Write an enzyme that holds these catalytic residues in place. Structure first.
Site, PDB file in Angstrom:
ATOM      1  N   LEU A   4       0.900  -0.644  -0.190  1.00 23.67           N
ATOM      2  CA  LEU A   4       0.160  -0.107   0.154  1.00 23.67           C
ATOM      3  C   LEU A   4       0.996   1.259   0.043  1.00 23.67           C
ATOM      4  CD1 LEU A   4      -2.851  -0.934   2.371  1.00 23.67           C
ATOM      5  CD2 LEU A   4      -2.345  -2.123  -0.058  1.00 23.67           C
ATOM      6  N   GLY A   5       1.869   0.878   1.148  1.00 25.03           N
ATOM      7  CA  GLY A   5       3.069   2.126   0.995  1.00 25.03           C
ATOM      8  C   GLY A   5       4.252   2.376   1.018  1.00 25.03           C
TER       9      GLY A   5
ATOM     10  N   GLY B 276       7.313   3.726   2.152  1.00 25.17           N
ATOM     11  CA  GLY B 276       7.876   5.063   2.651  1.00 25.17           C
ATOM     12  C   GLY B 276       9.441   4.489   3.519  1.00 25.17           C
ATOM     13  N   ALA B 277      10.124   5.306   3.809  1.00 22.90           N
ATOM     14  CA  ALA B 277      11.867   5.631   3.741  1.00 22.90           C
ATOM     15  C   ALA B 277      12.338   4.724   4.978  1.00 22.90           C
ATOM     16  CB  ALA B 277      12.635   7.039   3.962  1.00 22.90           C
ATOM     17  N   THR B 278      11.408   5.248   5.934  1.00 21.49           N
ATOM     18  CA  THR B 278      11.631   4.097   7.315  1.00 21.49           C
ATOM     19  C   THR B 278      11.223   3.105   7.199  1.00 21.49           C
ATOM     20  OG1 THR B 278      11.914   3.799   9.381  1.00 21.49           O
ATOM     21  CG2 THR B 278      10.672   5.749   8.434  1.00 21.49           C
ATOM     22  N   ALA B 279       9.848   2.712   6.560  1.00 23.81           N
ATOM     23  CA  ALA B 279       8.875   1.959   6.741  1.00 23.81           C
ATOM     24  C   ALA B 279       7.901   1.779   5.144  1.00 23.81           C
ATOM     25  CB  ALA B 279       8.262   1.852   7.595  1.00 23.81           C
ATOM     26  N   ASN B 280       7.655   0.093   5.407  1.00 29.74           N
ATOM     27  CA  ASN B 280       6.533  -0.314   4.432  1.00 29.74           C
ATOM     28  C   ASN B 280       5.566  -0.901   4.976  1.00 29.74           C
ATOM     29  OD1 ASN B 280       9.026  -0.536   2.381  1.00 29.74           O
ATOM     30  ND2 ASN B 280       8.213  -2.124   1.382  1.00 29.74           N
ATOM     31  N   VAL B 281       4.091  -0.329   4.554  1.00 28.81           N
ATOM     32  CA  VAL B 281       3.110  -0.613   5.069  1.00 28.81           C
ATOM     33  C   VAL B 281       2.671  -1.337   4.276  1.00 28.81           C
ATOM     34  CG1 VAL B 281       0.661   0.447   5.581  1.00 28.81           C
ATOM     35  CG2 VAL B 281       2.928   1.602   6.417  1.00 28.81           C
TER      36      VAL B 281
ATOM     37  N   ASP C  40       4.651  17.907   7.250  1.00 29.24           N
ATOM     38  CA  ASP C  40       5.198  17.569   5.621  1.00 29.24           C
ATOM     39  C   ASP C  40       3.356  17.300   5.502  1.00 29.24           C
ATOM     40  OD1 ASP C  40       7.207  17.173   5.538  1.00 29.24           O
ATOM     41  OD2 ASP C  40       7.868  15.648   5.554  1.00 29.24           O
TER      42      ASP C  40
HETATM   43  C1  LIG Z   1       1.746   5.248   3.014  1.00 28.38           C
HETATM   44  C2  LIG Z   1       2.047   5.970   4.384  1.00 28.38           C
HETATM   45  C3  LIG Z   1       1.740   7.536   4.820  1.00 28.38           C
HETATM   46  O1  LIG Z   1       1.288   5.176   5.427  1.00 28.38           O
HETATM   47  C4  LIG Z   1       1.546   5.052   5.941  1.00 28.38           C
HETATM   48  C5  LIG Z   1       2.474   5.947   7.048  1.00 28.38           C
HETATM   49  N1  LIG Z   1       2.416   6.119   7.887  1.00 28.38           N
HETATM   50  C6  LIG Z   1       1.716   5.440   9.058  1.00 28.38           C
HETATM   51  N2  LIG Z   1       0.464   5.346   8.314  1.00 28.38           N
HETATM   52  C7  LIG Z   1       0.076   4.658   6.903  1.00 28.38           C
HETATM   53  C8  LIG Z   1      -0.515   4.618   6.549  1.00 28.38           C
HETATM   54  C9  LIG Z   1      -2.110   3.567   7.373  1.00 28.38           C
HETATM   55  C10 LIG Z   1      -3.137   3.385   7.105  1.00 28.38           C
HETATM   56  C11 LIG Z   1      -2.932   3.696   5.519  1.00 28.38           C
HETATM   57  C12 LIG Z   1      -1.961   3.559   4.731  1.00 28.38           C
HETATM   58  C13 LIG Z   1      -1.262   3.848   5.243  1.00 28.38           C
HETATM   59  N3  LIG Z   1      -2.300   3.063   3.953  1.00 28.38           N
HETATM   60  C14 LIG Z   1      -3.473   2.720   3.036  1.00 28.38           C
HETATM   61  N4  LIG Z   1      -4.992   2.516   2.131  1.00 28.38           N
HETATM   62  C15 LIG Z   1      -4.791   1.737   2.090  1.00 28.38           C
HETATM   63  C16 LIG Z   1      -5.425   2.181   0.361  1.00 28.38           C
HETATM   64  C17 LIG Z   1      -5.034   2.439  -0.865  1.00 28.38           C
HETATM   65  C18 LIG Z   1      -6.231   1.821  -1.956  1.00 28.38           C
HETATM   66  C19 LIG Z   1      -5.668   2.836  -2.684  1.00 28.38           C
HETATM   67  N5  LIG Z   1      -6.556   0.705  -2.389  1.00 28.38           N
HETATM   68  C20 LIG Z   1      -5.491  -0.208  -2.626  1.00 28.38           C
HETATM   69  C21 LIG Z   1      -6.114  -1.377  -3.275  1.00 28.38           C
HETATM   70  N6  LIG Z   1      -6.131  -2.410  -2.315  1.00 28.38           N
HETATM   71  C22 LIG Z   1      -4.924  -3.230  -1.923  1.00 28.38           C
HETATM   72  O2  LIG Z   1      -5.645  -3.538  -0.923  1.00 28.38           O
HETATM   73  C23 LIG Z   1      -4.394  -3.259  -3.162  1.00 28.38           C
HETATM   74  C24 LIG Z   1      -3.181  -4.487  -1.773  1.00 28.38           C
HETATM   75  F1  LIG Z   1      -3.924  -5.752  -2.532  1.00 28.38           F
HETATM   76  F2  LIG Z   1      -2.234  -4.653  -3.012  1.00 28.38           F
HETATM   77  F3  LIG Z   1      -3.355  -3.794  -1.496  1.00 28.38           F
HETATM   78  C25 LIG Z   1      -7.335  -1.268  -1.171  1.00 28.38           C
HETATM   79  C26 LIG Z   1      -7.007  -0.659  -0.901  1.00 28.38           C
HETATM   80  C27 LIG Z   1      -4.279   2.824  -0.699  1.00 28.38           C
HETATM   81  C28 LIG Z   1      -3.044   2.828  -0.058  1.00 28.38           C
HETATM   82  N7  LIG Z   1      -3.410   2.720   0.718  1.00 28.38           N
HETATM   83  N8  LIG Z   1      -3.678   2.533   4.716  1.00 28.38           N
END
Ligand SMILES: CC(C)Oc1cncnc1-c1ccc2c(c1)N[C@@H](Nc1cc([C@@H](C)N3CCN(C(=O)CC(F)(F)F)CC3)ccn1)N2
Length: 628
Positions: free
Chosen positions: A17-18, A20-25, A137
């Site tokens: 889903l994400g 990042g620099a220090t981590a991956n979610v 940020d």
């Molecule tokens: C990115 C960085 C800032 O992230 C963080 C950093 N620090 C702390 N928290 C977060 C954080 C916290 C909660 C959440 C997120 C990040 N991302 C978030 N959800 C999601 C949902 C999505 C939406 C487009 N859909 C994509 C398709 N889809 C999948 O499942 C594809 C699969 F299956 F391949 F996975 C269902 C989800 C996109 C990006 N983030 N929810």
């Protein structure tokens, strides 16, 4: 295939889903419950590993709870690697950045959706401030979206407090690129991006090795300018302290939003706002409600933002700021009946109004007809190069343009259907003025006619008064005659108020477009064909290279996307736009003929009232004879 795990949760690294620099979610589930959470697996965490401070840090952030902030549920350590994983609530819908990729919002989010983000971002940012925690940020890629119980989105903050022990380049503050405003800067850049659909400060090529100019733009920002973009390579900067025409926001909203961004976007702390002024002025904007106003003469719809406790005098005045009509000539019509507003009536008790059923504004004094003025945008050039990355950005751009064209086309149809009703109602209301002038005239007519006869008979019932009795008698016919001269002129107005009387709205039921034409649905069909191709090119960009067959279908599809776009805009300009300008051309003329009729019939009504004073005097006076 392979997927990591933890005590309570598990996920596969494919579902990402994400990064990042220090981590991956990644998308993860609980080991019993099966509920989805976002898994923050920290990458490269050893030279840190402050199981001393971050333990207390994340325990503090866990209980930190609000509706506009992503909840941190727990911090666990991985099985296979002893790595620390934050498990947070999953936001199914992505980020604000994902929505801005949508072409429908390429030129800015809908006005309603903008208010949701603005309200949620400030409240969430304010909740951390009351705790002292502050972000800097905040970025649309860092503002996630979920769907609330009411169905409308709720935005949350999510990856803050990570700047102590170890800003986006485009959202950075000038002095920090190489307090109070330094906070507010990235947010204003975010808000400009959500309203316009593009970033405030843009070099010609963009953020690359020629990015020194960008920094000059920020450091050279004069006055309360909210944007500055050079349209040519190494060229001048087009500065502007107002928002563009493609902005989907109402004009009334821009007036309140512009000062916020001008005061929160400047490097000098001398002249720029604090969080308290900022929280005060925007929260000021959100509590006001909206009252929808359509100026029928000029064909422009309006959204007046008023607090519920404000009066109707400032309302007429603010309406003057958008329609420039003085409060005493502004006349309101609602649900086809005229509407009386006391000067001191609160806005909570105003009737409920929408953009498809607003409060119309009519003026006796002439006003020019403007219509919807939007920025004409043509399609961009399609290069035959296979750059998938280039084909993806071009897809977002060309599809976003037609999205803009389809929204306006949907707005133009609204304006016409609204014009058509407001015209049909107005004439029946002015004829009620006509129903009322003979109305009130009938009171004068029989009293007058019989009154002349009593005086015309008393000469038979009974030298000095007889010579003037006739002279008053001449004057009473002078007025009964003038009652007779205007009487002829009012039925002439009645012939025009009648169907086919040169004032009918039959023209409005013919020239323009109608929902029966289904012109807007037709463009969305072709526009949907284009967006799936768009979202497909992102999917092909993610592969970085494609197999052969798919590359050639991608070359087939990229060519039909251009053909689809040209087919729609052509249908937009040759049918919807043209038939609208023709409806607008005949619209100015008919009001001239209506306002002309309203002033003559106006006079006839006062001339009939002008006459009533004369018969009120002869009613009495001569019967007023004194005698023992
Ligand atoms: C990115 C960085 C800032 O992230 C963080 C950093 N620090 C702390 N928290 C977060 C954080 C916290 C909660 C959440 C997120 C990040 N991302 C978030 N959800 C999601 C949902 C999505 C939406 C487009 N859909 C994509 C398709 N889809 C999948 O499942 C594809 C699969 F299956 F391949 F996975 C269902 C989800 C996109 C990006 N983030 N929810």
């Amino acid at each position: 295939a392979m997927g990591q795990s933890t005590s309570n949760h598990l996920w596969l690294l494919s579902d990402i889903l994400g990064q990042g620099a220090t981590a991956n979610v990644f998308r993860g589930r609980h080991k019993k419950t099966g509920d989805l959470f976002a898994i923050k697996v920290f990458n490269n965490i050893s030279f840190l590993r402050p199981v001393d401070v971050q333990m207390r840090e994340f325990e503090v952030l866990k209980k930190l709870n609000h509706k506009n902030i992503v909840k941190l549920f727990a911090i666990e350590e991985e099985t296979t690697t002893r790595h620390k994983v934050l498990i947070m609530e999953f936001c199914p819908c992505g980020s604000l950045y994902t929505v801005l990729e949508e072409p429908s919002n390429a030129y800015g989010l809908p006005e309603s959706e903008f208010l949701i983000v603005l309200r949620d971002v400030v409240g969430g940012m304010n909740h951390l401030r009351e705790n002292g925690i502050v972000h800097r940020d905040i970025k649309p890629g860092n503002i996630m979206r979920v769907i609330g119980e009411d169905g409308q989105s709720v935005y949350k903050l999510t990856d803050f407090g990570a700047a102590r022990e170890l800003g986006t380049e485009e959202y950075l503050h000038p002095d920090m690129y190489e307090g109070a405003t330094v906070d507010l800067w990235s947010i204003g850049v975010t808000f400009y991006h959500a309203a316009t659909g593009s970033l405030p400060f843009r070099p010609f090529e963009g953020p690359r090795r020629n990015k020194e100019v960008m920094y000059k733009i920020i450091t050279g920002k004069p006055s309360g300018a909210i944007s500055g973009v050079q349209k040519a390579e190494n060229g001048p900067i087009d500065w502007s302290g107002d928002m563009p025409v493609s902005c989907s926001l109402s004009r009334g909203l821009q007036v309140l939003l512009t000062p916020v961004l001008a005061n929160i976007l400047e490097a000098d702390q001398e002249k720029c706002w604090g969080f308290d002024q900022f929280f005060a002025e925007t929260s000021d904007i959100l509590h006001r409600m909206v009252i929808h106003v359509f100026s029928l003469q000029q064909m422009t719809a309006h959204k007046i933002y008023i607090h519920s406790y404000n009066t109707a005098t400032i309302f007429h005045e603010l309406v003057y700021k958008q329609t420039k009509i003085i409060s005493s000539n502004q006349e309101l019509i609602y649900e086809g009946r005229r509407l009386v507003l006391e000067p001191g009536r609160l806005a909570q008790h105003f009737p409920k109004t929408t953009e498809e059923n607003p409060i119309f504004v009519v003026s006796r004094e002439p006003l020019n007809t403007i219509g919807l003025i939007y920025e004409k945008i043509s399609l961009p050039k399609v290069h035959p190069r296979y750059d998938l990355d280039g084909d993806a950005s071009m897809a977002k751009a060309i599809t976003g343009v037609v999205c803009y064209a389809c929204r306006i086309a949907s707005t133009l149809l609204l304006y016409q259907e609204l014009m058509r009703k407001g015209i049909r109602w107005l004439i029946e209301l002015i004829k009620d003025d006509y129903n009322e002038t003979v109305h009130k005239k009938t009171e004068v007519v029989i009293t007058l006619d019989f009154c002349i006869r009593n005086i015309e008979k008393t000469v038979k019932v009974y030298a000095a008064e007889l010579g003037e009795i006739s002279d008053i008698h001449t004057k009473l016919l002078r007025l009964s005659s003038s009652q007779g001269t205007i009487e002829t002129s009012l039925q002439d107005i009645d012939s025009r108020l009648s169907p086919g009387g040169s004032l009918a709205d039959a023209w409005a039921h013919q020239e323009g477009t109608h929902p029966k034409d289904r012109n807007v649905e037709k463009l969305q069909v072709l526009l949907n064909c284009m967006t799936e191709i768009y979202y497909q090119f992102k999917k092909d960009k993610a592969e970085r290279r494609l197999a052969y067959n798919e590359e050639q279908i991608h070359k087939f599809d990229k060519q039909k996307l251009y053909y689809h776009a040209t087919k729609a805009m052509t249908h937009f300009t040759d049918e919807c736009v043209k038939k609208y300008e023709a409806f607008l051309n005949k619209s100015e003329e008919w009001i001239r003929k209506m306002l002309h009729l309203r002033k003559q019939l106006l006079s006839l009504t006062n001339q009939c009232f002008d006459i009533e004073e004369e018969v009120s005097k002869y009613q009495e006076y001569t019967n007023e004879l004194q005698e023992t």
